[PDB]
Ligand binder design. Structure first.
Ligand SMILES: OC[C@H]1O[C@@H](c2nc(-c3ccc4ccccc4c3)n[nH]2)[C@H](O)[C@@H](O)[C@@H]1O
Ligand SMILES: OC[C@H]1O[C@@H](c2nc(-c3ccc4ccccc4c3)n[nH]2)[C@H](O)[C@@H](O)[C@@H]1O
Ligand SMILES: OC[C@H]1O[C@@H](c2nc(-c3ccc4ccccc4c3)n[nH]2)[C@H](O)[C@@H](O)[C@@H]1O
Ligand SMILES: OC[C@H]1O[C@@H](c2nc(-c3ccc4ccccc4c3)n[nH]2)[C@H](O)[C@@H](O)[C@@H]1O
Ligand SMILES: *Cc1c(COP(=O)(O)O)cnc(C)c1O
Ligand SMILES: *Cc1c(COP(=O)(O)O)cnc(C)c1O
Lengths: 810, 810
């Protein structure tokens, strides 16, 4: 059908067909008379997977021979989503598989919908790791993603009576055809115990052992025959574990619980023992694998020339004292030499400045669980602070501020401080965020070691986030500028030459309308919800958080509703307002925000006077596969966090690439997006970081805004009085009370400017041709936000390796 | 190499080779440069498994079309052992696979040793189920084995300091290539709750749900292209289970523990809740599957014409009240009609008369866990006892004896009574055992319903237990009488014509010597133990139990030792005495017996005066794969249980078929073995059942034997005084005290006759030609003990179906 999907050659189609039938028979043990769509999905998955095998084996063989510097990306989260389509795209098999299945009487799109998301992350941080793996493979880097194979990923969200309910995501129930268990490379991980000091160094003894069993998933690069590995560890008890008899066998679950479930908090630290066990488990198993591979190339001076470890936030920070432990206690290196190796090997990426998100582990927990690591952390701290004292003599308050050990009611270790001390590079994830790091929370560290601090603005992979989810747009683009942009997204700038081309304008607008029709249809089928496909699709999808200000969106929606009720017969641009995202199960205010949104929908969607001029829809169970459907359908992207709070954002970039205009604050990467597209082509509003600081200095008083803005007062009165909850009039009191007396995110302060900016959005939507022209200017300047650009920068500026677009032989 | 192993055709060998290489690449994702023997085993297993698929699909298709009566064999235990060789044997692929692997530079025997036993049973009862499945497939019956897929089977036994230690049998660690998960046929099972009575019958409500997920294993018949199914259920929690958040997900293990571990007691009832859950779980899931398959053929009058359910002991006895529950509560049949259907569908096999082995469940447990089933059991009991009262008016003690409900400190349900009331047939497992049932524990039931009681003497499959484990013997037999005997074992009678044939005598003796050399070699390799291969191999392998009297064997061994010490320079026939078996982890006396055996070895094996005239070896970790090695090597089979205690025995039959002579009591199937071979060709000794009864009537006084037999007194003094435990002189006091004051199994009473009989064994071993002639007479008359004979009898006399030796088309 479409060119970017590759060729459907007769020989290939014929071979895919027979391999599909072979798997259906020999692998699934079914005949076509009792096979279900799920069986057909599996037969296709095994057929496609077979094409990865040769490339996977030859890629790993190649790294063994060439011995390049290896990149180890450590993360507690990898939000991969579905794998089938991505694999076809990267191997150029999509059209051929479409043809083969069609000849077999099957609709491939239908089979794709059967696959479960691999949801081993919470949101942005996890999904960034996934885009990064795709880019590292596409750029030919010898890169390995290491994490935990959670049995249960991020929970499935059900909405019941307008409230979030959670159910376990049993993603492995039907099997996972994309992983290969490797029980032969199982490794031991130690916990608890005690330290004993001998004539010959420290020894960690009397430990409990848990086994780490690896499962390997292939990561194909884009049409370059490179297939890298993501290795995820699963916890297993040893067979003599606890070894009356029956109870000892049942108690094996204590050990195996380490890999059972993903902690479901986004941007929030919960200091539980099980989480600490997960963090050490991934680090300890991974480092043994790293050292093994390094020895199979005795002198660790070359270690940093052959190994880079990138810490995705502080969650794998124990890699620093673990590497020291191994080098000092096991390999017998002197401390100073070991520390030199460690610093040159490790680099740290920070993804947040919110205080409640920073990891500060109680000393008593580390003391019990990881006694030798605590000793090492203390020694690191003493040596570090000796350097600080030498650099800033007499500055005693600096010593307390910079210490890895925090004093107080309960002593804690600040893991960010540990990572900075033990890494040769520290980066933020968007220019404004990296600046904020140097000016505020890490200022002291920047003054001691300015050379460590860098920026690496985030990106997204244009394979998944354009070619895969929006083939219509990819095609009309390729028609004008060829296919090269898929691995060189900066080529999209060539599209500026078409901003006055009538045919292109029409095609861009047509693709959006088709995407909107398709999404409107999906809504009716799977959720029996009707929507007007000619309305402006106004979408805010991301995790539910106070800092992301879904509440500000709600205030605008109610404003719109109230204005319609006031002048029913006045024309207003019709909108469908869609808000989706998951709340952490323990985050009460986030759960209340979900209920407010559905409550607003209950009123608005059933008021005859509104008609279909305004609809408010809560999109249930937002996840990667849903993002792939809704983002291509969106007209307006809401990126409205309080300035200074969203470190980068990446949903923002997905919307830009897919033909939505953005309404947003000057926060995170929004700043760079506006810079690339031009401020005239972006709907910017609200306080800047400097304005937020000014307000904090004089004191934020929400009452002032309530007193001066009658439309806002009306909304608050509606909320308090029970207008949106007739049977439970005080249902939203916690929300009102937060907004009026302890709003850390200054929702009222940006309300007036937000509403006025939304009016400018509506005015532009009334002129389709100029709306589309502005869309073309955004798509055309989205190239900087490819994760290929991001990864090339990490490679050259942190890891010391050169990317390559050269193909291995098939 | 050898004929019974089939043909090695060029086309087949070529195809096996390329499929082996294909699996190594695509399935295992390895190249030959990093592959290990384990990878090679897996590649071979997948290659062989592919040959099962077509036959498996076509067999099950065939049953769907023809709609024959289906046989459901319900068991909590299936002791399958290894699958690779058995599969090759039954598909005629052994020689071809041997040739293919040899051409690839691999030794197939080596690869076979990598496979784990599937050890989902304790011993005889579990292994009987496995032989039965093989026979049902070989006889073309539409038969299904249903059980539980335990994550951990029977524990691995390690001996440390002469004591048994247990370690978990993590048999699934590397995967199981022989099963197919079928998550699509998952079914709900209910627990707890309460009963509510409506206008329209009872309703079981407020239950907790556990899901039963099936895994299917193929069961190939011998060269007939039939492949039946063994379906084993695994426990899974529902996704809303327990649904703070993290704890709710971790608590899923409560539900999943149902299928975690096999209870490791042989012939001993332990009344624990988890065991009851396992029993209901298998029954409830299985019955839904049965009914489903029956409806997909509304009138249940035909149910017994289309379904037979065989209960392997009382462990699945809840099938009776569950079937009633489904028919009465769900399908709305009247009670009397439902009971008629149930009785005609169910049949019960009893495997023990030991009181401590009989299941008697506390009423309070059933009341809490299965409230509706308890109501039904009460109703069954009332109606049954009404029949008894009508038949035996005024006999009130009979009413209390026959009741399903036992009165006392704690009320219990007698599950054997339930099974008899609810089955149209009840059988024992050897003629003497079936007689014992009618004369003692089930006498009252036999008087009420004589027609229900039958015998079905046990058997073993001659595929695994001759062709597979003793190819040398199978071949020298086939040379004389052709290959037909492998599925018609009665043809072995033809061998009586060769009892005076000098060439045959020599060949039989040669095969035994080769087996003994091979086993002696295995001992040195894997256990660094040296043995004299010219000695008489005297073996007792079976679970460790007081009733099996390993202790009597020990007394003979010590007698032999003491006699040598007394007259060192007198010639005695050299023996290697091997004893193996597992003790239940909580069975203290059994663990003490293991320690006594190793203790005797420590003394005997290191006494220079004994030399290699006597060796005592404890065979560690006895299991099906070890049985396949040691049984072909044995000269003397010890089958020495107290008369009346071993219901049948099946190890006895394995030894007979493999060229060992038997020393044994007239117990279980030993009686029928002696009858078939002739008493002159069997070493029979000891009390008969009638003698044991006589002694019990006058009172067993062990002191009498001690007082009259000086050789016995000497042994007891040695045990008490610390001769076999220098550092812990009173280590064996529990044993001595049991033997002298509370021996339920009358070890001393059979001692004199046992020792004298062992002397006759030694005298015959001195004459190789006559030893071998007697061996030929045993092998030649072992035909009755094929499980094909047994299954043909169940089919004709209980299930109402005809066996068939006709081949399906390949
Ligand atoms: O090896 C992990 C899984 O191995 C499956 C298995 N997987 C593969 C396999 C084979 C090829 C593959 C190629 C790409 C990605 C994944 C791949 C996986 N071979 N065997 C078993 O079916 C499953 O129970 C087990 O957990
Ligand atoms: O850099 C990728 C993304 O990382 C998100 C992010 N996620 C987390 C996060 C994610 C999971 C966490 C779990 C425990 C403790 C803290 C945690 C913090 N921190 N930062 C940022 O909010 C977003 O702007 C960003 O684009
Ligand atoms: O389906 C059960 C197992 O399915 C394996 C699988 N097994 C088969 C299969 C395929 C053919 C078979 C033929 C005979 C016996 C067993 C057979 C099993 N196909 N897929 C997966 O690799 C494993 O993770 C999963 O538990
Ligand atoms: O019939 C097969 C075999 O069954 C054995 C047998 N095994 C059990 C057994 C096995 C497991 C049990 C678990 C719980 C409670 C009772 C249990 C009883 N009962 N009988 C007999 O001892 C043997 O002579 C016999 O040949
Ligand atoms: C991209 C993405 C995110 C990140 O969105 P932000 O708006 O940057 O927070 C979260 N969840 C999913 C499923 C995504 O695909
Ligand atoms: C046959 C067999 C048994 C049964 O032996 P008995 O001597 O009849 O108790 C027990 N265990 C294993 C492994 C077997 O193969």
């Amino acid at each position: 059908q479409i060119s970017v999907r590759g060729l459907a050659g007769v020989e290939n189609v014929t071979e895919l067909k027979k391999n599909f039938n072979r798997h259906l028979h020999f692998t699934l043990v079914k005949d076509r008379n009792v096979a279900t769509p799920r069986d057909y999905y599996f037969a296709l998955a095994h057929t496609v997977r077979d094409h990865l095998v040769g490339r996977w084996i030859r890629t790993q063989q190649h790294y063994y021979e060439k011995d390049p510097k290896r990149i180890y990306y450590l993360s507690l989260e990898f939000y991969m989503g579905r794998t089938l389509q991505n694999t076809m795209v990267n191997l150029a098999l999509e059209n051929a598989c479409d043809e083969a299945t069609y000849q077999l009487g099957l609709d491939m799109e239908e089979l794709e919908e059967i696959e479960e998301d691999a949801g081993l992350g919470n949101g942005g941080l996890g999904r960034l790791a996934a885009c990064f793996l795709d880019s590292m493979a596409t750029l030919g880097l010898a890169a390995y993603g290491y994490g935990i194979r959670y049995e249960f990923g991020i929970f499935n969200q059900k909405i019941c009576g307008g409230w979030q309910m959670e159910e376990a995501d049993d993603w492995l129930r039907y099997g996972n055809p994309w992983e290969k268990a490797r029980p032969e490379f199982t490794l031991p991980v130690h916990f608890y115990g005690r330290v004993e000091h001998t004539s010959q160094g420290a020894k960690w003894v009397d430990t409990q052992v848990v086994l780490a069993m690896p499962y390997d998933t292939p990561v194909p690069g884009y049409r370059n025959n490179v297939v890298n590995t993501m290795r995820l560890w699963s916890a297993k008890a040893p067979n003599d574990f606890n070894l009356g008899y029956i109870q000892a066998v049942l108690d094996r679950n204590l050990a195996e619980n380490i890999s059972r479930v993903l902690y479901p908090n986004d941007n929030f630290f919960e200091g539980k023992e099980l989480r600490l066990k997960q963090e050490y488990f991934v680090v300890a198993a991974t480092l043994q694998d790293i050292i093994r591979r390094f020895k199979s190339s005795t002198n660790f001076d070359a270690f940093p020339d052959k190994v880079a470890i990138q810490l995705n936030d502080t969650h794998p920070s124990l890699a620093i004292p673990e590497l020291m432990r191994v080098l000092v206690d096991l390999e017998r290196l002197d401390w100073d030499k070991a520390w030199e190796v460690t610093v040159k090997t490790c680099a740290y990426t920070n993804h947040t400045v919110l205080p409640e998100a920073l990891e500060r582990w109680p000393v008593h927990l580390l003391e019990t669980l990881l006694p030798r690591h605590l000793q090492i952390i203390y020694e690191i701290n003493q040596r570090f602070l000796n350097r600080v004292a030498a650099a800033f003599p007499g500055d005693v308050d600096r010593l307390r501020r910079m210490s890895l050990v925090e004093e107080g009611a309960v002593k804690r270790i600040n893991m960010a401080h540990l990572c900075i001390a033990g890494s040769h590079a520290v980066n933020g994830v968007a220019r404004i965020h990296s600046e904020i790091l140097k000016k505020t929370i890490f200022k002291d560290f920047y003054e001691l070691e300015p050379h460590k601090f860098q920026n690496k603005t985030n990106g997204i992979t244009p394979r998944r986030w354009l070619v895969l989810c929006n083939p219509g747009l990819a095609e009309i683009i390729a028609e004008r500028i060829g296919e090269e942009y898929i691995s060189d997204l900066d080529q999209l700038r060539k599209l500026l030459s078409y901003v006055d081309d009538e045919a292109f304008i029409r095609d861009v607008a047509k693709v959006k309308q088709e995407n909107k029709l398709k999404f409107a249809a999906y809504l009716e089928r799977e959720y029996k919800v009707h929507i007007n496909p000619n309305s402006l699709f106004d979408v805010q999808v991301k995790r539910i958080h106070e800092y992301k200000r879904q509440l500000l969106n709600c205030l605008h929606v109610i404003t719109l509703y109230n204005r319609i009720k006031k002048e029913p017969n006045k024309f207003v641009v019709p909108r469908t307002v869609m808000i989706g995202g998951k709340a952490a199960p323990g985050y009460h205010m986030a759960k209340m925000i979900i209920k407010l949104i559905t409550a607003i929908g209950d009123v608005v969607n059933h008021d005859p006077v509104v008609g279909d001029r305004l609809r408010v829809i809560f999109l249930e169970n937002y996840r990667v596969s849903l993002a792939e459907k809704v983002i291509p359908a969106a007209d307006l992207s809401e990126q409205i966090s309080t300035a200074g709070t969203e470190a980068s954002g990446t949903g923002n970039m997905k919307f830009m690439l897919n033909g939505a205009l953005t309404i947003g604050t000057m926060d995170g990467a929004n700043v760079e997006m506006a810079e690339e597209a031009g401020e005239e082509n972006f709907f910017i509003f609200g306080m800047r970081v400097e304005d937020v600081d000014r307000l904090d200095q004089r004191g934020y008083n929400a009452q002032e805004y309530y007193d001066r803005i009658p439309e806002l007062r009306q909304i608050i009165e509606q909320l308090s009085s029970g207008f949106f909850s007739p049977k439970q009039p005080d249902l939203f009191k916690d929300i009102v009370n937060m907004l009026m007396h302890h709003d850390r995110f200054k929702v009222f302060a940006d309300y007036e400017e937000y509403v006025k900016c939304q009016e400018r959005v509506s005015a532009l939507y009334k002129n389709p041709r100029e709306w589309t022209r502005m869309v073309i200017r955004n798509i055309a300047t989205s190239g900087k936000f490819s994760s290929d650009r991001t990864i090339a920068q990490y490679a050259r500026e942190i890891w010391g390796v050169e990317p390559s677009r050269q193909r291995l032989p098939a």
